[PDB]
Write a protein that binds this ligand. Structure first.
Ligand SMILES: *[C@@H]1O[C@H](CO)[C@@H](O[C@@H]2O[C@H](CO)[C@@H](O)[C@H](O)[C@H]2NC(C)=O)[C@H](O)[C@H]1NC(C)=O
Ligand SMILES: [Br-]
Ligand SMILES: [Br-]
Ligand SMILES: [Br-]
Ligand SMILES: [Br-]
Ligand SMILES: [Br-]
Ligand SMILES: [Br-]
Ligand SMILES: [Br-]
Ligand SMILES: [Br-]
Ligand SMILES: [Br-]
Ligand SMILES: [Br-]
Ligand SMILES: [Br-]
Ligand SMILES: [Br-]
Ligand SMILES: [K+]
Ligand SMILES: [K+]
Lengths: 292, 13, 631, 184
C-alpha cells in the first residue's frame, strides 16, 4: 500500500536486446519529502548503462555514489539512487537504458522501492517486466486461495510416445479442437476451442460441437502461437479446471499437450505426411484400443 | 592542619 | 553511672541485628537483659539473649537478636535494656523489607509469538540467597497484568526461572516485570522489556561526539563520528543520514537544516552540527545551557539490503567541561576544628572526572587532584565562631581558561554543643581508592578545654553497613592526646560503602552528663564479594562448531547463563543486568541519610541510621519515617 | 559440471536470538578457592557475535554478575538472507540474498539458487530450478534479489543455496517469515 508515495514504473524496448526503464515518483504529503531513496533491482541478466547513470547522477538533487558508478557493468543487479527531495505537485521522473548482457529464458521481474530516510516502514514497491501486467508473477486466484501459474507452459515428436502419455488415469481428456476465437488480455489469454472429437472423455462430459475456453499466461503466447481457425490435438488434467461448470475453464499448464493438427489440404504436402499419419493413427488407436 | 585550643600537639599557629 | 543503648534507626524482621550495650563510669559485673516488645501495649516479641558486661573488656559488649514476624502503616517496637535495676527503653521503627529482588530477562526486546525467559534472584539485605514467597507480574504498556505468578524460592539457592509466551496479537511498547516479596508488597522491584516487530540487523552503528558535551561558545560546533561495522567484525561501506536536535526535558526540537547525507567509507564517517544552524533553529546563546543535543544516524549499506538507525542523546550544552558536587560532604562543621570536603567532580554526562585539580577559594592555591572515582579531599581550618560557613571550590584544570573552570558554593552550619560547652569530636580518613583487604586509618580529633580534656579515656565507634551494625569497638585515649589513630581492617563485608559514627561521654561543668558525636561516610570499591569469569578455551569459530566454555567462580556456586545475538542490542540495549546496577540499588536502601556529622549529638546518630538512648535522659529523637527526608 | 550438488549442501537453519539458557553448579575441587567448570557447547548457525552473560549465586558470597563474554562466529563465504518480519498472503514481495566473499585474493564464480516451496509462488517450480551464476570479487558482497508470492499463511520458510565452481566451497540458508491473512 502506497499512501505516502505514488510510484509508477514502466519498462519499454529502446526505440542486442536493450530497453529503457522509466521511474516516476510523487510524494503524497503536504510539502516535499526531504532525502529519499529509490532502491532498484534489475531484471535477470540486465544491467544499466554506466554513462546513463552518470547523467542522472550529475543531475541536480540526485546522488549516485561513486562506489556504484565505477562498478563493472555486469555486477549491478541492484542500485540505489538518492533523491535530495521528492516533489508533491508533479511526478519526478528519471529514465535509463538497461542492456541484456546475459540471455536467459524466463526473466524475473525487476523492482523499485521508494521511501524517506526516516521511515522505511512506510514504503512503496512497484514491479516491472517486459511482458507482464504490472510486473506480477502469474497466478490464478479465486477469492482468497491462489495457485501459481509460473508453471511450464506446455509439454516439450513420434508415435508410440503420445499413446503412452495420453493413457494415464491422470489424463482426463484428449481432444481434437478448432480455435474459434482468441481473446487476448493483459495477463491471461483466452482461447475458445470447439471440440470436434472427444478422443477421451473425462469429468467434463462435453459433447461434440460445443465450446470450452482454454486459459494461458501471456508469457506462453509466443511459444504456443495459437491462431484462429486452426486445429489442435490437446490433452490435460482433471485438476486443471477453473469454475464449477457454468463459468468453466481449462488451464494450459506443464501437464498440457498442445500440438498443431494440419488440415486436410496441408497433410498432402511432403512435410506434414509424417505428422498427419501419426495423428491419424493416434486417434484410431485411442478410439479403438482405449487405455486398458 | 590544626585545632583552635591551648593544649595538644595540633594547636593552631 | 550512665548506661547507653545503640541500635539501627530502622529494624528488620527475621534478620539478625546487633544492640551495643555500654556501662559508663561503673564497677563490677553488670547483668543485662534485653527484651523487645510491641509498641501500643505489651506482647513481648522474641526477647531473651543474655550478656554480662565485665570490667576486663571495659564494660562494652553486644546482644544479637532476631525479630520474628508477628502480624496499614508504620510498625514500631519498644526495646528495653535493664542495667541492674535501671530500665532504658527506646521505641524503634520496623521494616517489612525482606531484601532485594533482581530480575533478568534473556533479551532486551522480543517479537510477538516469542518466549520471554526470565529469572528472579531472591536475596536478603546482605545480598545472600533466601527462600521466601515472591509475587511476579508481567504487564503490558498500559499496565495490565498479562501473566501472574506466586512462587517460593525456598531450597532453590535464590534463583527463580520463569517463562512467558507472547501471543501473536499483543500491543507493542515497553512491557514490565514487577516483583515483590509476599511480606513486603509496598516495595516492588521492576524491570523492562520492549515488544516490537523486527528482524535482526547485520551491522551496528555507533554515534560518537568528539567531546561528550557541547561548549556553547565553540565555533567548531558539535563534531560527530559515525562508525558502522558488521556484527562479525568487518567494516561497513554505505551512506549515513544524520540529523541533530535539541532536548529541554520531554520536549524535542528537530533542526532540519542539520540533515546531512555522508559516505561511510571504511566503516567510518564524519559530520558536524554548525553553530549557526543550531542557533537559527531556536529563533541569545546561553539559554541553551542546561539543554541537551541528540543525534540520529541512519546507515544504508551499498547493497540497500540492510539499514540501521541509531541515536546518541544526552549531549549536554554547557559553559564548563566539569561539574562540582558537594553531595559527599557533611553539611555541618565543628567550629575551631578542620572541615573536610569530599569534592566530587564529574564530566557533564555524570561520569566521574579523573585527575582534575580542585581548590577552595580564599585559602586558594592549596590544590588537590581527584582520584579514579573523581573525588578529592580538601581540608580547611575553621575559627571557633558559631557562624554559617560558606565554601567555594573551583576547578584549576590548566588548558582550561578561567571562564571554562567549574565553580560551586555550599553552606555548612555549626554543630551545636550540649550546653554551650565547646566540646567537639571530629573524624577523618584519606579519600583514596579503598579495596577490601586493606587497612584504613580513622583519625579521632578532640576539641575541649585543657581543664576538662583529661576526663575522656575512650571513644566508642560504630560501623554501619547495608542497614545493620557490622562492627563496634573502643578507641582508647590518654590525656593530652589530640589525635588517636584507629587501624580499621576492610573486608568484603564493607562492600558498597559504610558509615563510621563515634562518640565520647562525660559529666561536664555543673552536674550534667554530655554525649559528643561525629560521623564519616566511606566509599568501598565495587566488586563481587566473590568472583565470576567466563572465557573460552584457547583463542574465529565456524557456525555449528563446538567450543569449550570455561567458567571460573566460587566453590559450590550456582551459575546461570545466557547467550544473546549482539544484533539484539543494536535494536535495544536498555535494562541489562550488571553488578554495579545491583550495588546502586543496595545504596538506595541505606538507612543512613547524610554524608556525615549533624546538628547536634542526637542529629549525628540519627542521620547515620542509629538510635541513642542513655539512662540519664539524653537520646535521639524518634524516627517515624521509613525513607530519608527530601531536600 | 565441477560444482557441489544442491543436495550435498546442508543449509544453516539454527538462528535463535538467544540460547544457552543454562544452569550449572561449580562442583570441581577448587584451586585457590576458584572452581573451574568446563562446558561443551555447540555454536548456533548465525554469523554474528554472541554475548554470554553468566550470573552466579552463592550461599556464602552472594550474587555476582560477570563481565559479558563475546564469541564471533564467522565464515569467508556465506549467504545473508534478508527476509522481512512478515508478509501478507498473496502480495508479491522482493527479498534479497546477499552473498559475501571475505577472501583476500580469490574472486568467486558462484551458482545461487532459490529453492522451490509450494507455500510460495516463484520462478522455482517442482521440476525447474531458479538458479543464477555470478562472479564476486574478493572482499565484497553481491545482492541477489528474489520475487516471491506467499500463497499460504503461517510460519513459512525461504531457502537459498550457493556454491563456487571448481572449489569445495558452499553455503545454504533457510529462514522463516510469518505469513498473515489479507482481510477485506
Ligand atoms: C559482638 O560481640 C561478638 C562476640 O563477643 C563479636 O564477635 C567478635 O568479632 C570478631 C571480628 O572482629 C570475630 O572474629 C570474633 O569471633 C569475635 N571476638 C571474639 C574473640 O569473641 C562481634 O563482632 C560483636 N558485634 C559487633 C557489632 O561488633
Ligand atoms: Br519532473
Ligand atoms: Br538453597
Ligand atoms: Br497486550
Ligand atoms: Br551510539
Ligand atoms: Br584550651
Ligand atoms: Br546503612
Ligand atoms: Br576481604
Ligand atoms: Br567524666
Ligand atoms: Br561492580
Ligand atoms: Br582447561
Ligand atoms: Br536453535
Ligand atoms: Br549447547
Ligand atoms: K548531483
Ligand atoms: K562503592
Amino acid at each position: 500500500t502506497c499512501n505516502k508515495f505514488d510510484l509508477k514504473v514502466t519498462i519499454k524496448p529502446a526505440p542486442k536486446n536493450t530497453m529503457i526503464l522509466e521511474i516516476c515518483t510523487r510524494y503524497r504529503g503536504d510539502q516535499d519529502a526531504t532525502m529519499s531513496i529509490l532502491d532498484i533491482s534489475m531484471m535477470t541478466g540486465f544491467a544499466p548503462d554506466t554513462d546513463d547513470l552518470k547523467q542522472l547522477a550529475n543531475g541536480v538533487d540526485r546522488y549516485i555514489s561513486k562506489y556504484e558508478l565505477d562498478k563493472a557493468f555486469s555486477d549491478r543487479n541492484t542500485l540505489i539512487i538518492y533523491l535530495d527531495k521528492v516533489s508533491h505537485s508533479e511526478d519526478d521522473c528519471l529514465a535509463f537504458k538497461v542492456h541484456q548482457y546475459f540471455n536467459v529464458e524466463l526473466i524475473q521481474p525487476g523492482a523499485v522501492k521508494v521511501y524517506a530516510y526516516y521511515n522505511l516502514e512506510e514504503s512503496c514497491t512497484r514491479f516491472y517486466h517486459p511482458e507482464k501486467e504490472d510486473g506480477k508473477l502469474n497466478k490464478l486466484c479465486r477469492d482468497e486461495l491462489c495457485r501459481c501459474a509460473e508453471e511450464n507452459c506446455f509439454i516439450q515428436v513420434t508415435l508410440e510416445e503420445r499413446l503412452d502419455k495420453a493413457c494415464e488415469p491422470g489424463v482426463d481428456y484428449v481432444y481434437k479442437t478448432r480455435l474459434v476465437k482468441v481473446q487476448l488480455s493483459n495477463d491471461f489469454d483466452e482461447y475458445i476451442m470447439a471440440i470436434e472429437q472427444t478422443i477421451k472423455s473425462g469429468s467434463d462430459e462435453v459433447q461434440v460441437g460445443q465450446q470450452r475456453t482454454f486459459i494461458s499466461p501471456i508469457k506462453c503466447r509466443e511459444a504456443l502461437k495459437l491462431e484462429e481457425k486452426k486445429h489442435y490435438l490437446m490433452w490435460g488434467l482433471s485438476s486443471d479446471f477453473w469454475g464449477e461448470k457454468p463459468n468453466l475453464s481449462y488451464i494450459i499448464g506443464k501437464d498440457t499437450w498442445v500440438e498443431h493438427w494440419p488440415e486436410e489440404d496441408e497433410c498432402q504436402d511432403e512435410e506434414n505426411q509424417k505428422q498427419c499419419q501419426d495423428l491419424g493413427a493416434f486417434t484410431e488407436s485411442m478410439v479403438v484400443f482405449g487405455c486398458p | 592542619i590544626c585545632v583552635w585550643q591551648d593544649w595538644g600537639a595540633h594547636r593552631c599557629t | 553511672p550512665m548506661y547507653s543503648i545503640i541500635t539501627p534507626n530502622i529494624l528488620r524482621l527475621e534478620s539478625e541485628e546487633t544492640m551495643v550495650l555500654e556501662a559508663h563510669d561503673a564497677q563490677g559485673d553488670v547483668p543485662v537483659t534485653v527484651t523487645v516488645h510491641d509498641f501500643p501495649g505489651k506482647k513481648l516479641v522474641l526477647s531473651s539473649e543474655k550478656t554480662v558486661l565485665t570490667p576486663a573488656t571495659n564494660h562494652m559488649g553486644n546482644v544479637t537478636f532476631t525479630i520474628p514476624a508477628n502480624r496499614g502503616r508504620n510498625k514500631f517496637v519498644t526495646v528495653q535494656a535493664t542495667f541492674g535495676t535501671q530500665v532504658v527503653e527506646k521505641v524503634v521503627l520496623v521494616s517489612l523489607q525482606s531484601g532485594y529482588l533482581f530480575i533478568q530477562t534473556d533479551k532486551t526486546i522480543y517479537t510477538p509469538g516469542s518466549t520471554v525467559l526470565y529469572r528472579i534472584f531472591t536475596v536478603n539485605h546482605k545480598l545472600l540467597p533466601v527462600g521466601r514467597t515472591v509475587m511476579v507480574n508481567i504487564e503490558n504498556p498500559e499496565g495490565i497484568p498479562v501473566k501472574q505468578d506466586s512462587l517460593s524460592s525456598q531450597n532453590q539457592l535464590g534463583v527463580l526461572p520463569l517463562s512467558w509466551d507472547i501471543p501473536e496479537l499483543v500491543n507493542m511498547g515497553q512491557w514490565k516485570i514487577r516483583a515483590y516479596y509476599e511480606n513486603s508488597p509496598q516495595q516492588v522491584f521492576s524491570t523492562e522489556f520492549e515488544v516490537k516487530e523486527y528482524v535482526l540487523p547485520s551491522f551496528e552503528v555507533i554515534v560518537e561526539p568528539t567531546e561528550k558535551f557541547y561548549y556553547i561558545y565553540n565555533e567548531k560546533g558539535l563534531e560527530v563520528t559515525i562508525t558502522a561495522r558488521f556484527l562479525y567484525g568487518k567494516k561497513v561501506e554505505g551512506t549515513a543520514f544524520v540529523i541533530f536536535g535539541i532536548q529541554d526535558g520531554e520536549q524535542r526540537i528537530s533542526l532540519p537544516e542539520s540533515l546531512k547525507r555522508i559516505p561511510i567509507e571504511d566503516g567510518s564517517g564524519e559530520v558536524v552540527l554548525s553553530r549557526k544552524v543550531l542557533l537559527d533553529g531556536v529563533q541569545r546563546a546561553e539559554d541553551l545551557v542546561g539543554k541537551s543535543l541528540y543525534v540520529s544516524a541512519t546507515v544504508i549499506l551499498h547493497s540497500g539490503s540492510d539499514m540501521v538507525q541509531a541515536e546518541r542523546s544526552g549531549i549536554p550544552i554547557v559553559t564548563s567541561p566539569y561539574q562540582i558536587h558537594f553531595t559527599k560532604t557533611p553539611k555541618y562543621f565543628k567550629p575551631g576544628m578542620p572541615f573536610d570536603l569530599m569534592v566530587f567532580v564529574t564530566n557533564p554526562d555524570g561520569s566521574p572526572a579523573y585527575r582534575v585539580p580542585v581548590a577552595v577559594q580564599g585559602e586558594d592555591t592549596v590544590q588537590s587532584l581527584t582520584q579514579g572515582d573523581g573525588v578529592a579531599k580538601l581540608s580547611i581550618n575553621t575559627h571557633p565562631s558559631q557562624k554559617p560557613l560558606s565554601i567555594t571550590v573551583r576547578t584549576k584544570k590548566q588548558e582550561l581558561s578561567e571562564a571554562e573552570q567549574a565553580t560551586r558554593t555550599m553552606q555548612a552550619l555549626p554543630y551545636s554543643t550540649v550546653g554551650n560547652s565547646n566540646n567537639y569530636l571530629h573524624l577523618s580518613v584519606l579519600r583514596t581508592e579503598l579495596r577490601p583487604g586493606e587497612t584504613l586509618n580513622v583519625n579521632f580529633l578532640l576539641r575541649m578545654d585543657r581543664a576538662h580534656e583529661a576526663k575522656i579515656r575512650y571513644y566508642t565507634y560504630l560501623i554501619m553497613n547495608k542497614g545493620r551494625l557490622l562492627k563496634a569497638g573502643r578507641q582508647v585515649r590518654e590525656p593530652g592526646q589530640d589525635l588517636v589513630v584507629l587501624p580499621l581492617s576492610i573486608t568484603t563485608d564493607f562492600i558498597p560503602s559504610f558509615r563510621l559514627v563515634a562518640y565520647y561521654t562525660l559529666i561536664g561543668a555543673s552536674g550534667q552528663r554530655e554525649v559528643v558525636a561525629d560521623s564519616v561516610w566511606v566509599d568501598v570499591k565495587d566488586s563481587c564479594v566473590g568472583s565470576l569469569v567466563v572465557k573460552s578455551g584457547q583463542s574465529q569459530p565456524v557456525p555449528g562448531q563446538q567450543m569449550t566454555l570455561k567458567i571460573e567462580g566460587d566453590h559450590g556456586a550456582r551459575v546461570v547463563l545466557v547467550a544473546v545475538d549482539k544484533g539484539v542490542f543494536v535494536l535495544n540495549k536498555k535494562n541489562k543486568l550488571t553488578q554495579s546496577k545491583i550495588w546502586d540499588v543496595v545504596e538506595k536502601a541505606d538507612i543512613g541519610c547524610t554524608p556525615g556529622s549533624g546538628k547536634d549529638y542526637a542529629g549525628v546518630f540519627s542521620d547515620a541510621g542509629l538510635t541513642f538512648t542513655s539512662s540519664s535522659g539524653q537520646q535521639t529523637a524518634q524516627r517515624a519515617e521509613l525513607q530519608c527526608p527530601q531536600p | 559440471e565441477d560444482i557441489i550438488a544442491e543436495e550435498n549442501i546442508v543449509s544453516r537453519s539454527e538462528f535463535p536470538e538467544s540460547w544457552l539458557w543454562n544452569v550449572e553448579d561449580l562442583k570441581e575441587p577448587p584451586k585457590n578457592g576458584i572452581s573451574t567448570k568446563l562446558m561443551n557447547i555447540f555454536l548456533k548457525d548465525s554469523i554474528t557475535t554472541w554475548e554470554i552473560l553468566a550470573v552466579s549465586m552463592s550461599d556464602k558470597k552472594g550474587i555476582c554478575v560477570a563481565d559479558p563474554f563475546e564469541v564471533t562466529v564467522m565464515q569467508d563465504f556465506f549467504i545473508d538472507l534478508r527476509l522481512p518480519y512478515s508478509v501478507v498472503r498473496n502480495e508479491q514481495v522482493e527479498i534479497r540474498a546477499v552473498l559475501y566473499n571475505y577472501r583476500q585474493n580469490q574472486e568467486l564464480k558462484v551458482r545461487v539458487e532459490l529453492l522451490h516451496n509450494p507455500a510460495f509462488c516463484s520462478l522455482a517450480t517442482t521440476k525447474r530450478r531458479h538458479q543464477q551464476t555470478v562472479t564476486i570479487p574478493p572482499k565484497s558482497s553481491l545482492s541477489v534479489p528474489y520475487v516471491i508470492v506467499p500463497l499460504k499463511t503461517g510460519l513459512q520458510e525461504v531457502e537459498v543455496k550457493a556454491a563456487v565452481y571448481h572449489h569445495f566451497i558452499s553455503d545454504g540458508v533457510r529462514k522463516s517469515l510469518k505469513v498473515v491473512p489479507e482481510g477485506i
